[PDB]
Nucleic acid binder design. Structure first.
Lengths: 56, 142, 110
RNA sequence: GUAACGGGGCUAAACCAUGCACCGAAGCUGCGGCAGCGACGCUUAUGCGUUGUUGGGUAGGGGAGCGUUCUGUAAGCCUGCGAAGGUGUGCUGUGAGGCAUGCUGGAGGUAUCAGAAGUGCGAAUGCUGACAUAAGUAACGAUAAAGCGGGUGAAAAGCCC
RNA sequence: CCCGGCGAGGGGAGUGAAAAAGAACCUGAAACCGUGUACGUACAAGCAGUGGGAGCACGCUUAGGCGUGUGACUGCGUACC
């Protein structure tokens, strides 16, 4: 239920070898506004594939 | 002055070939390990491999004394509790006659990473032909 | 020339902030801002403000340009911890540690 | 789980007898060095010329020393041309230790010969403070339930309508 | 003066012998946590060191076959009270 010895700082780093994050590969550029956005997502101004979806 | 020590980047290693027909198993493996390690060289070094490459032919025709051809047993375990398996000398010569020579030499060599490397310089064949003519091996009456 | 920017006594553990700092070490400023913008973590907000401050300091004080700047050095150190009490069962009491962090960013024209 | 030669393997690499070689210990010898106790020379406020022998060690007995704080020697000596302390390097003694010096530091420190002790810590489920481990794990307190629009605001699942 | 939420917290300017003396402030040790550089490490079993020892890197060097750091392989070796 509890440990008999104190793990080391080495064993601690090994367990954290799979805890790293991943950055976004690339951002898509809109056809009309020319803004950077997530693929399959709308822009902050309200554009998506040049159709002027929700503005507010 | 200091004592000479060999260097693995400048040591020479030659090639030889041997015939095992009619030869005694134990008294043959003894001389193989002696040369795979380098005891026959004046540049011998325990922490360096100064041995030579050796090819063995006709492994399926070694000899044994007494009734060892039927009473000698080779044991091994798998890992499960059923486990223990066994095989006789005759049964191994028919299934894989190359393991008889390898198993005997592996026991006469030291243990550890270095001993595992000397074993890699031993090429055993169950016939009379080999495909290492490029290395121009010499005959070794032994 | 190297310009500095720091955020001392931040309300977050160093272990959590270091996960984000490792994504922009050695990258260009323009590329780094885009990464943090689309990173769903609270530490990403703090680091962004620090990076923006350093960029402004270079222009106003050191007279540099944005397009030529790069993140050369970035690290997170531990700060003072605040002690708190947490009641448990059967009269027992445990101690709580609210950890902080010191953030540092360095941008250079080389 | 081979498991009644340590193993590989051996028809001797087994057993009896005889004989000549070699390996083999911190044992003996050789080279260099330190110390203790003895006798001589009676050297001579004793160190040698030398000469023999000894030197594993708990409880415990005997002998000789290092360093720390304080008092006298000191209205002395060193010191802002950089003290104590902190951090490195080099040299040195049989050991506890000592000397010199670079960086930091920014005002006290102390020879020699004597004297006095709150005089040396790894342990006592020791005392106080600080920081690790488990771990970014368990959990976030009744299973009466939430959804949308608008507003404020740097930012609204939780605030206002 | 500038970034920031008329924020917190920082970068310049200036004061001062000194701000790495900035009010969380003289000196600023250790445990503990980090960034950077050199070497080693993904067919190898055990108090993690010791004796031997290649290679790489660096400073020397009148090459002087030395020093410093790392330590493939190998003999021996089951902590303290």
């Amino acid at each position: 239920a509890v440990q008999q010895n104190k793990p080391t700082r080495s064993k601690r780093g090994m367990r954290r070898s799979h805890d790293a994050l991943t950055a976004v590969t690339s951002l898509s550029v809109d056809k009309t506004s020319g803004e950077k956005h997530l693929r399959h997502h709308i822009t902050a101004d309200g554009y998506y594939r040049g159709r002027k979806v929700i503005a507010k | 002055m200091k004592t000479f020590t060999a260097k693995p980047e400048t040591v020479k290693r030659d090639w030889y070939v041997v015939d095992a027909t009619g030869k005694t198993l134990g008294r043959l493996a003894t001389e193989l390990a002696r040369r795979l390690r380098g005891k026959h060289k004046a540049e011998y070094t325990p922490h360096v491999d100064t041995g030579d490459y050796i090819i063995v032919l006709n492994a399926d025709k070694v000899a044994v004394t007494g009734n060892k051809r039927t009473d000698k047993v080779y044991y091994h375990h798998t890992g499960h509790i059923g486990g223990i398996k066994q095989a006789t000398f005759e049964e191994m010569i028919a299934r894989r006659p190359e393991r008889v020579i390898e198993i005997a030499v592996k026991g006469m060599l030291p243990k550890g990473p270095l001993g595992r490397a000397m074993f890699r310089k031993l090429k055993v064949y169950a016939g009379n032909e080999h495909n290492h003519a490029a290395q121009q091996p010499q005959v070794l009456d032994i | 020339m190297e310009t500095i920017a720091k955020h001392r006594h931040a309300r977050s553990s160093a272990q959590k902030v270091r996960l984000v700092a490792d994504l922009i070490r050695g990258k260009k400023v323009s590329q780094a801002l885009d990464i943090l913008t689309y990173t769903n973590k609270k530490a990403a907000v703090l680091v962004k403000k620090v990076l923006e401050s350093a960029i402004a300091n270079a222009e106003h004080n050191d007279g540099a340009d944005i397009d030529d700047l790069k993140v050369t050095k970035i690290f997170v150190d531990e700060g003072p911890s605040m002690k708190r009490i947490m009641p448990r069962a059967k009269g027992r009491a445990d101690r709580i540690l609210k950890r902080t962090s010191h953030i540092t960013v360095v941008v250079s024209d080389r």
